[PDB]
Amino acid sequence: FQSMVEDHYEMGEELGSGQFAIVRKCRQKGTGKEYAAKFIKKRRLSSSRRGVSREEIEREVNILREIRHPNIITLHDIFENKTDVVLILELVSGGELFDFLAEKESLTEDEATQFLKQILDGVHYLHSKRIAHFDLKPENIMLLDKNVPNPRIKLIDFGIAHKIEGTPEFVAPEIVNYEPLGLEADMWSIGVITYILLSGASPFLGETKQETLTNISAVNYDFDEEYFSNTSELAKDFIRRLLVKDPKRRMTIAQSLEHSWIKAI
Amino acid sequence: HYEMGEELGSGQFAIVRKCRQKEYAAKFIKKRRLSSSRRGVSREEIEREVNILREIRHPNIITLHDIFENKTDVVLILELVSGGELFDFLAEKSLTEDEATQFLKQILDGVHYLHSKRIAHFDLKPENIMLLDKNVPNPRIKLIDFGIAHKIEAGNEFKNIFGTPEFVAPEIVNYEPLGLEADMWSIGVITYILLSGASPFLGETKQETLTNISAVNYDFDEEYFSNTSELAKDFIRRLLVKDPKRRMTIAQSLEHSWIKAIRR
Numbered sequence A: 001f002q003s004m005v006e007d008h009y010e011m012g013e014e015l016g017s018g019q020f021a022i023v024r025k026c027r028q029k030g031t032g033k034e035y036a037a038k039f040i041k042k043r044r045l046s047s048s049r050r051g052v053s054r055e056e057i058e059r060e061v062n063i064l065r066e067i068r069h070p071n072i073i074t075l076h077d078i079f080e081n082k083t084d085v086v087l088i089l090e091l092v093s094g095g096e097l098f099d100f101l102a103e104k105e106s107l108t109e110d111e112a113t114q115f116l117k118q119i120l121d122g123v124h125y126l127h128s129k130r131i132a133h134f135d136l137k138p139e140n141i142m143l144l145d146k147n148v149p150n151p152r153i154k155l156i157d158f159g160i161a162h163k164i165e166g167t168p169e170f171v172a173p174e175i176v177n178y179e180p181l182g183l184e185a186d187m188w189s190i191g192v193i194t195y196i197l198l199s200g201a202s203p204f205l206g207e208t209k210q211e212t213l214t215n216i217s218a219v220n221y222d223f224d225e226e227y228f229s230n231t232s233e234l235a236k237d238f239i240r241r242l243l244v245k246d247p248k249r250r251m252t253i254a255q256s257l258e259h260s261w262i263k264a265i
Numbered sequence B: 001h002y003e004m005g006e007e008l009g010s011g012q013f014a015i016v017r018k019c020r021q022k023e024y025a026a027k028f029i030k031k032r033r034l035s036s037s038r039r040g041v042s043r044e045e046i047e048r049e050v051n052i053l054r055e056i057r058h059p060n061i062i063t064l065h066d067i068f069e070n071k072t073d074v075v076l077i078l079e080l081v082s083g084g085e086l087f088d089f090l091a092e093k094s095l096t097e098d099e100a101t102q103f104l105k106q107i108l109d110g111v112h113y114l115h116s117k118r119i120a121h122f123d124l125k126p127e128n129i130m131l132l133d134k135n136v137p138n139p140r141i142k143l144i145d146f147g148i149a150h151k152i153e154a155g156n157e158f159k160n161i162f163g164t165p166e167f168v169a170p171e172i173v174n175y176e177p178l179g180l181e182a183d184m185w186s187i188g189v190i191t192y193i194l195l196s197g198a199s200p201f202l203g204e205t206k207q208e209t210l211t212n213i214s215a216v217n218y219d220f221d222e223e224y225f226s227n228t229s230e231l232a233k234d235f236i237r238r239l240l241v242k243d244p245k246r247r248m249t250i251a252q253s254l255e256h257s258w259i260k261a262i263r264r
């Protein structure tokens, strides 16, 4: 008896997918307006059906419903049936940012900083609401429309996003020493994104996955002159202030926006 | 629909009153008014506690029988315990090691049940270990206060394991969630105090206590442990281990020769 999404939206081409998600272009039957419909497969232990837990779906949905910013996708409706939760989301048609940048001729640092600034604005909005994205990477940085003079960044995939934040005689050492994961992880990811934006190279990427993980944990990277010889010193400083091991030492999003490199843009 | 009575206890954002429908305990939890506010308990934290209580059914753990809500408070109707805190009952009583293990076994049974459901209590201490009724020949332990209890995290909660790790922060790469082992440390401390009346890591200030815990700075002063067996000391030593992965688990604790022994 729940409202069926197909009674309100006609479904079209598949646009993307994940382990437990399929995204289709759809058209609102009432208006003709186009959206993206994200079908999230529900876990059903009873039927041995693998999928996303109720709690995880609720987490993502509750975050999406709070978000209203021009650089983040917007949520328009929610449907649920036996097997799926279906989210009607803002349609982004310009593809991945880094695919668009690859197609450009003579991409300059100043032009690159313009897109980075949009990413900072979206993240500043998120962090102002205590939302960490936790999966900031090029594949989650889309463009609304790539056939415009100044294409607009749209962040997607809030699948692992989280809202952040007596006697001690009986607490364990790991509790004493506990430091929760927070907004700082996004700021590290921004550092990595900035490095690849300015160079075309991934800073921690190893020949094998174990090497990559080792590099990240040691914070082992370089500004190779092949790629960085004519990158501004302000850009390198921006990156260096984000790619530090201690989360509490990293620039926060407000600091990032007040950095001389960004203030110049 | 419930006639309230006297105030039984309180915490930072909770007050418990005796009530009658059949007598019960009425836990009043104050809701945060604004998500940004530091005053009161968030909706998510209340639901978390309720969901834990709803799925637990075990003789050594309090049960949930009803829920009520308004703009300011969430009220849980819980099983009433009238035997007080365990340690008070033992204080008014000397106590043999064998008698001490009879009560500890019930604590271990309740924790075993929780851990079987991947729930860590996270606030095991004497004040949360009650007796259902202290005027019977074999009093039953009842664990209370699931205010910070959690189902233990998946491990891919903060990480997309289906994608590249290239943009992931080192604290996520090296993330170690809190787990069931924290309760097992707490059990070691409870056991130490049960046998000696002394707190192993207690310092002059809260920060000193925390520093002692972090260094695992304790001993078995003969002043307090002259009459304690080597097996009891061994049980405690196997729980008060810094590395959570080298600490006794609940099943190992139950198999330990100090507990496994048959008693009257």
Ligand SMILES: CC(C)(C)c1nc2c3ccc(F)cc3c3c(=O)[nH]ccc3c2[nH]1
Pocket (backbone or CB within 6 Å): A015, A016, A017, A018, A021, A023, A036, A038, A073, A089, A090, A091, A092, A093, A095, A156, A157
């Ligand atoms: C698979 C994942 C859930 C990350 C996702 N992929 C897309 C996507 C892929 C291609 C495309 F043209 C559009 C989208 C898209 C979209 O347009 N809106 C919201 C999410 C979303 C999306 N969300």
Ligand SMILES: CC(C)(C)c1nc2c3ccc(F)cc3c3c(=O)[nH]ccc3c2[nH]1
Pocket (backbone or CB within 6 Å): B008, B009, B010, B011, B014, B016, B025, B027, B062, B078, B079, B080, B081, B082, B084, B144, B145
């Ligand atoms: C403060 C805290 C929430 C931990 C709590 N205190 C009590 C409590 C205190 C004295 C007493 F006689 C009974 C209780 C009691 C109880 O009887 N049932 C459930 C919880 C609970 C409780 N829960």
Ligand SMILES: [Cl-]
Pocket (backbone or CB within 6 Å): A038, A156, A157, A158
């Ligand atoms: Cl998405």
Ligand SMILES: [Cl-]
Pocket (backbone or CB within 6 Å): B027, B144, B145, B146
């Ligand atoms: Cl309680």
